[PDB]
């Protein structure tokens, strides 16, 4: 691989961030991993995507600034729960402060559409104005692979420490 994109997952606890990671990389589903990787080729270039997870640190707003260090891309994840959706406002402000970056928004758990709170209509409008792309996903329906890859395509347009 000739390019390495560090991308981070954010948003409220419970949404599905951990599962969206294990889906896109390991095609698995739980009912925790530090980070998982996946390589794609874009314009003949091998791109490793390093996708970091929160270790549950988002629960009481304890995400380290170091989590965003050198991150060239990021996904905000909401839930079935308008609470998380409204909280997506918070994580946007968090990210542009600590990162550098290309951002995308995802509405996970679309498989449970029979318990929907706040429709697709608003989520698209919310995304369209705020310059970040949208993709309604489900980790169990699955727009998982599309969402991650769509983000990776977009980052591709953008472009001595010592070991102990």
């Amino acid at each position: 691989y000739d390019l390495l994109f560090k991308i981070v997952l954010i948003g409220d606890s419970g949404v599905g961030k951990s599962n969206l990671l294990s889906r896109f990389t390991k095609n698995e589903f739980n009912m925790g991993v530090e980070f998982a990787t996946r390589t794609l080729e874009i314009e003949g270039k091998r791109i490793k995507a390093q996708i970091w997870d929160t270790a549950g640190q988002e629960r009481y707003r304890a995400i380290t600034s170091a989590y965003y260090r050198g991150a060239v891309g990021a996904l905000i994840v909401y839930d079935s729960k308008s609470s998380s959706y409204e909280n997506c406002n918070h994580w946007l402000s968090e990210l542009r402060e600590n990162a550098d970056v290309a951002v995308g928004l995802i509405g996970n758990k679309s498989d449970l559409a029979h318990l929907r709170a706040v429709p697709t209509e608003e989520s698209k409008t919310f995304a369209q104005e705020n310059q970040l792309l949208f993709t309604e996903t489900s980790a169990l329906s699955e727009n998982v692979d599309k969402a991650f890859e769509e983000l990776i395509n977009t980052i591709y347009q953008k472009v001595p420490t010592i070991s102990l």
């Binding site: 530090e34 629960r59 304890a62 420490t161």
Partner: protein
């Protein structure tokens, strides 16, 4: 939502986060709380606007800060200046716990020592040792023979000791054996052993010997200097270990003050804490002094730290992107040394073209600002100064009576060796067994 833990930790200073990370790795259930909205505790790295908040009367206008300093996101400014010894115990902990995964490092360009108005690069190798104008030919010869003994000495082999006894000889006698002049003593004691006064001269050699050897080993590990410095500032360190804790099951609460410490009915022993998020309980607590002021005592020492922003490299450093300055006390009629720790945009701690020069010493007059004048004059023109005084606290007790294991305040030393000493000491007090690195 959990309420019962094996360990509660308060404050996200480096000391606490290392212990948290170690205990979580050990398989303990750790709850770590900070009343502040960011990680680092007393030794965090902060933004330029935060510096104005903490140390200045009013903030600075948007256009003044914009034209002079650029964007606040480029600024990660250490509140307490420290480097890491390259062969020191913190690097050893970073390797074993693999926190090296969360932090990148660069080597400090060199160390410089003040002598009669000018600074001099401490020789890092033989080429530099030959060229150096610090000492004369016979002085260099005598010290060469001294440092050869440092490296060839073996504890359990008495035939290598050249008649010296680390425990029964003072360092002055070690010096005496090798014929060393007072100026060569000052160099060794202050530039290599990193003592901040001459008390060591009349004390058993063993501590001086250990520090000197650590110096030599640290410079040998990679070259150039004994020192490393983290990209994005010292604040990356606690955050690294906190992340280790979380991965290993630790729970973290920022911006969560302690409403009340709970104590066992009749013993005074720790029971838990009340917060806005609820009540949490543990058989014991680890905390910095700010959480238990009544259970700490003052060491008697106050430390002035002056953060200086510069538009230019430090004069007489060959445009070094980082360095350490050592001003021995006898060069100033002082009781203790003055340090300067200098880093730049090479370390992602300030915006392009700036340098951070942090001057510290232990205060000994009623005018701390004037005490620092000698060091101010070494830096060239200074864009801005941020002045802060801190008092050094330490626990009254070891925690065996109340289960309140308190850390010491970050001291005036130039590196983290005394911090990792605290860690090992606290770990033993908390677990009953010495720290074994996996």
């Amino acid at each position: 939502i959990d309420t019962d833990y094996d360990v509660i930790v308060l404050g996200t200073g480096i000391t606490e986060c290392i212990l948290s990370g170690l205990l979580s790795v050990d398989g303990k259930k750790v709850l770590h709380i900070d009343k502040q909205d960011h990680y680092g505790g007393e030794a965090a790295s902060v933004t330029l606007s935060q510096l104005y908040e903490k140390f200045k009367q009013n903030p600075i206008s948007k256009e003044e800060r914009e034209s002079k300093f650029g964007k606040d996101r480029d600024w990660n400014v250490d509140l307490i200046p420290k480097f890491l010894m390259a062969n020191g115990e913190l690097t050893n902990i970073l390797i074993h716990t693999d926190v090296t995964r969360y932090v990148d490092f660069k080597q400090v360009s060199g160390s410089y020592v003040f002598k009669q108005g000018k600074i001099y690069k401490v020789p890092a190798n033989e080429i530099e040792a030959i060229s150096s104008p610090l000492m004369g030919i016979f002085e260099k010869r005598r010290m060469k023979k001294f440092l050869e003994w440092i490296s060839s000495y073996k504890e359990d082999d008495l035939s290598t000791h050249q008649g010296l006894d680390l425990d029964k000889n003072t360092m002055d006698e070690v010096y005496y054996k090798f014929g060393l002049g007072n100026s060569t003593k000052e160099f060794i004691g202050h530039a290599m052993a990193l003592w901040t006064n001459d008390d060591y001269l009349q004390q058993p050699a063993r501590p001086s010997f250990e520090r000197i050897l650590l110096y030599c080993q640290s410079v040998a590990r990679y070259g150039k200097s004994p020192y490393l410095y983290p990209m994005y500032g010292l604040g990356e360190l606690p955050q690294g270990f906190a992340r280790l804790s979380a991965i290993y099951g630790g729970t973290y609460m920022l911006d969560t003050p302690i409403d009340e410490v709970l104590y066992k009915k009749d013993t005074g022993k720790f029971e838990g804490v009340k917060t806005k998020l609820g009540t949490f309980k543990a058989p014991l607590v680890i905390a910095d002094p700010t959480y238990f002021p009544e259970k700490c005592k003052s060491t008697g020492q106050r430390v002035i730290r002056a953060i200086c922003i510069l538009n230019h490299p430090v004069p007489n450093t060959s445009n070094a992107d980082s360095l350490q300055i050592i001003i021995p006390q006898s060069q100033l009629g002082r009781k203790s040394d003055i340090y300067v720790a200098i880093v730049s945009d090479a370390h992602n701690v300030c915006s392009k073209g700036h340098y951070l020069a942090i001057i510290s010493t232990i205060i000994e007059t009623d005018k701390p600002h004037i005490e620092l004048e000698p060091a101010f004059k070494l830096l060239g023109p200074i864009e801005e100064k941020f002045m802060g005084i801190a008092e050094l606290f330490e626990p009254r007790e070891d925690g065996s009576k109340d289960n309140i294991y308190l850390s010491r305040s970050y001291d005036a030393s130039s590196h983290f060796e005394s911090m990792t000493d605290d860690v090992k000491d606290i770990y033993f007090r908390v677990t009953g067994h010495p720290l074994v690195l996996k």
